[model samples]
Target: CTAKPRDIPMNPMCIYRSATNRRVWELSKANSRFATTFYQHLADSKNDNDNIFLSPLSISTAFAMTKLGACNDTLQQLMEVFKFDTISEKTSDQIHFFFAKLNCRLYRKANKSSKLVSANRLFGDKSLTFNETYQDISELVYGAKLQPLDFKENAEQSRAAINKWVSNKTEGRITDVIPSEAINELTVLVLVNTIYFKGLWKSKFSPENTRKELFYKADGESCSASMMYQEGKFRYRRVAEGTQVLELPFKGDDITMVLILPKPEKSLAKVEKELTPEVLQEWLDELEEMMLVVHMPRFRIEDGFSLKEQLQDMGLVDLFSPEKSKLPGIVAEGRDDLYVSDAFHKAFLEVNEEGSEAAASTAVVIAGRSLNRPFLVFIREVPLNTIIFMGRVANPCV
Candidate 1:
């Protein structure tokens, strides 16, 4: 008998919530302004700009928080919230597929055992191993199944491999993600690869009908760009300024990618400065079925940065602390001596009519309005940096 494919029910809300929390923690500790802008970007649909940055300290802080049990409640909440949506038996079984896989390793590390011991353990499976000396406890949190390449042995080769992986994962939208020097002896690597974003505009824009328009920049300058134009019905709203807000639906109706284009009077900076979590939630709540003219630009952006200095500037000192720290769970004897030597992250995204293979789409509208207009947003690249403090574990005193 052959094994069956794993069915996993993905809860978008949970994913969003968790991602938001992680990002909030990261941004809040790094740059408050950037944090606000990121939240605002998530709320607005028109600002389909691909953003990528690194926070080595923030990643370390997150890892520390994970050790402290901040993620437990979030995971539990996800399970509970999605359990009610299991309308069908198949969907119900699928609900815990990915969650179970990711969480099981954490559970075992925290509790020493789990119910589904015999099942596929995504992390701690003994078959996986690394050439580097990973502190025993760190292995528990990261899980053994995920392999870390030998970046120390051949730095150039590893960098090329990672860059290639990111490019292929983003469908070629993102290339040249990792720098040659990004690979070093002290690098602790973690990559989250997501791809395949296929969406149709609620009101599809005709390629032949696009018009060249002037896009105002923050510096009081304007640039001519090809703007995709569609005169049709859409979910439109005016929150602040004269900005028109619109929602674009992907294949399945449940998930929506929003776009917010600021009026010529208001700049992206102004919008970002005033953005808040509550305000964003309010805007999302006020969205309703309606019809309006929508004009957007077909654009792409790639950004990169070194987060070591940025994170230190943000008050996250413990992860890099050579003296006092709490990342022992990742090491062999639970040593707090290990400081992050380097941390880096990279991602790629693209938005178009075609849906991504890694993503899912659903069809469920709140009202009688039909969700049309396919939109695709791709994250082309996100590169990060992290450094760890290293120290020798102390011997147990009798």
Candidate 2:
């Protein structure tokens, strides 16, 4: 059931086809895995009562723009890239805001040719004052504000900021959004954000509907959790490796929260380890349109991690070193002294049929769900390559 290549969105494909964009995508994907692992580890510890959501857009966008600005072919390619999609005026404005405000330091003299430049101009404006009033608690919660120093001087401060934000945003549900000593001189602060969401199920599961169930582990071990049960029709599909895909509609929106459940024989780690962009695209393509008997557990998860170490472990070293980095071309003077200072992220997500709402200021709703009941699905790994295109759809259109 491979999806027709023609069915794929043009804009995202155009970006992914480029070598630079592909490389950035891989790096971002690796960082995403690190964050996911960190969060899962945290969830296993104490605070398992909260759900988490994350977005890699800020870091990925910053990395992409910096490389695009430095290279002529890449920049020209990006300009052409935007032409394929009819993005809304508001969406375009938001993109500009991200580049200008969040990535100001990365670019040299900013101009309005692209969103990155726009963000730089808006935040770097000399007239704008930095104080508590204009400062958003959300920004502080997710370390959205940039520290004015090199990687060495700014790493610790940035990490602390992100941790504080994650803890505060989740009401201490996620105390350590990222690890201590995660930031350092060699670290590149690429992407960071937090998301929080809450919702009620349409056919709210009765306390009686919840039954103690055994969750089998890979090592022949098992644990018991309250598995919530409901009998309903759902948009469902099946995949290789005994995985199931279920789509749960939210209340009041056309958006559906997707969940993938691996066969009891497979562990989440094993499933995630085998995942890749190509595999994900294939899974999305093969999703059969159908109805399913849905049974899910009422589960909450809160997790956090320091991505610097994990990213380095993933082979994205160039971005953290001035001498080896390709980002220096962004400036006219060739100041290659720049390196990533910190990368922090936090996320919260609750899904019900009223359209999924997440609390990360950096959040993007790719699609809308119907206003109805809460639907929950568990997936092995995030559908990244295909999922990233979700942002391209206009909210009002659906």
Q: At residue 78, what lDDT does model 2 achieve?
A: 29
The candidate maximizing TM-score is: 1
Clashes of each: 72, 47
* RMSD vs true structure, all candidates: 16.0, 13.5
Residue lDDT tens for model 2, 1-398? 01212212211111222222333234334434433443334334322222334444433443333332222233332222322112222222123233332223222223222111112100111112233321232132222453332334565665565556555654454455445654455443323333333334433556676676765442455656566566666556677777766656444222235666567545544544455445545665677656445555544433233334544444445544445443333223312344444344444443222233333222111011101011123222132221211110001101
Writing each residue's lDDT as its tens digit, candidate 1 over 3-81 gives 2223321221112122223322232222223333333333242232323222222222223222221122333322222
**What TM-score would each prediction reach against the true structure?**
0.54, 0.50
Best by lDDT: 2
Model 2 misplaced stretches (Cα beyond 4 Å)? 1-159, 166-174, 183-191, 199-203, 219-221, 240-242, 263-292, 308-315, 326-336, 341-398
Model 1 regions lying over 4 Å from their true place = 1-144, 188-196, 214-223, 309-315, 322-325, 333-336, 345-398
Let me know the TM-score candidate 2 reaches against the reference structure. 0.50
lDDT, residue 1, model 1: 5
